[PDB]
Every structure is written in C-alpha cells, then in structure tokens.
Write a protein that binds this ligand. Structure first.
Ligand SMILES: [Mg+2]
Lengths: 192, 21, 21, 21
C-alpha cells in the first residue's frame, strides 16, 4: 500500500509575497506526487493569525483534485506568522481521523517559513513530540524579502533549520529548488 | 484611468536591541 | 491608469540577543 | 493600473534578556 498521511502548512502573512509563488511551488509538488485513487493523501492548511482549514486529508483521490485544492486555498493576509502553531495544529487538528487522516501510515509534515521564530519554546515542544512519534518533518524556506545587500539571510532562517537534528539535506529545502521536492519523495519511499 | 491593485507587503521587522548587563 | 495603494506593513522583528553578563 | 508601492517593514523586535551576573 503506497499510501501515506501528508500535510502541508503554508503561511500568507505580510512576510510572504504574491500567493502565486507558493501555489506554483505546490503545483510542482503535487504534479510530481503520485496521488492515485487511494494513495498519497495531501492536506493543505493555512496559518498566520490563526489556523484555517479549507480541505480535509481524505477529501480527494486524485492529483488533479489536490492540485486544484492547493491553488484554491488562497490566503489574503496574516497579521503574524507563528511557525510553532503551524506544526502544533497540523499534528493534532490536521492528522486527526475525523479530518480524513488514516490509521497513522507515514506522517509527513511539510511546512513553509520565512524566518520569524518569536518563541523557540513552543516549536521545540512540538519538535520533541513529533520526534518521539517519528514523524517525517520537512521545512521549506521561502525567500521574498528583496535583499538590499548581504544581511546574512542564513542567520535569519537558521532558527528554523535547527528544528531538525537530522541531516538538513533531507529536511530543509528552498522554494526555488525543484530537486528539493524530488528529494522529499525519494526519501518518503522509506518507512522513515 | 482605473487604479491598480495594492502593492507588495512589508518584510519582517529588524532584530531587537541587546539586553542590559 | 494610476498605481494602486501601498502594501501592508510587515510583522514584528525577532527578539534581541542576551546582554553582557 | 500598475500595483502600488511596497509596504513598510515590520516594527523593531523586543529587547534581549539581561546578562546573568
Ligand atoms: Mg509572516
């Protein structure tokens, strides 16, 4: 059974630019994803000032359905970005059976961030929780701050890339990297 | 002429100042 | 025609570093 | 028309913690 429980948590706050960027990234993600009649269930969740849910995990059964759902969930704005709340609300309120989650077959959590960790305590608690439950966490960084010089964006996103103690090459990716998405699927083939 | 749409949003604020001794 | 309204300001910046101990 | 100008950056982050003496 090549099925698995996947959740994608996106932010559309003021730190994020035109939603066409993330929908294009999600487009390429879902395109490469093998969403068959009963395999690869992907739920899209949006966060910011709160966590909104538009679609459920088992609300679709085709690449086309999930692809349309991904570009259908457009965030018009967000007062703030709370990365820690995105991870928290995903493993409970998105990975719940009533929301279309399975019996716990390969819990994949993909989250995007720009660099705004105002509280490392909440995210570390969710991290240690998902680490004990051996959840496959993937963090993608989006660059959209224009960059008016070498301000060292590496020192801004470093806070989120340190979430995973495992190799960053299989956990931390970029929106402008399509091979990153391939790296996810190839390593998702394993049990962990 | 019809006006355009809202411009691009602002980026995250700068890091806070160092704490006291 | 004319350009649209300005974008919305960003979010609060990251916390400052620890002071001199 | 064309999109408006970019929004202003976010507010300055909170001051860091006091250095433990
Ligand atoms: Mg934000």
């Amino acid at each position: 059974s090549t099925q698995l429980d996947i959740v994608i948590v996106l932010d559309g706050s003021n730190s994020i630019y035109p939603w066409d960027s993330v929908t294009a990234f999600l487009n390429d993600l879902l395109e490469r994803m093998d969403i068959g009649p009963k395999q690869t269930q992907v739920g899209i969740v949006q966060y910011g000032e709160n966590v909104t849910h538009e679609f459920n995990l088992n609300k679709y059964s085709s690449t086309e359905e999930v692809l349309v759902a991904a570009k259908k969930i457009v965030q018009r704005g967000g007062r703030q970005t709370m990365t820690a709340l995105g991870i928290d609300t995903a493993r409970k309120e998105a990975f719940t059976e009533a929301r279309g989650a399975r019996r716990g077959v390969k819990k994949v959590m993909v989250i995007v961030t720009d660099g705004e960790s105002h509280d490392n305590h909440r995210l570390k608690k969710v991290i240690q929780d998902c680490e004990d439950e051996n959840i496959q966490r993937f963090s993608i960084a989006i660059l959209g701050s224009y960059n008016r010089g070498n301000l060292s964006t590496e020192k801004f996103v470093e806070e989120i890339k340190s979430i995973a103690s495992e190799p960053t090459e299989k956990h931390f990716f970029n929106v402008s990297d399509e091979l990153a998405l391939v790296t996810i699927v190839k390593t998702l083939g394993e049990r962990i | 002429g019809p006006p355009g749409p809202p411009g691009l949003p602002g980026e995250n604020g700068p890091p806070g100042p160092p704490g006291p001794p």
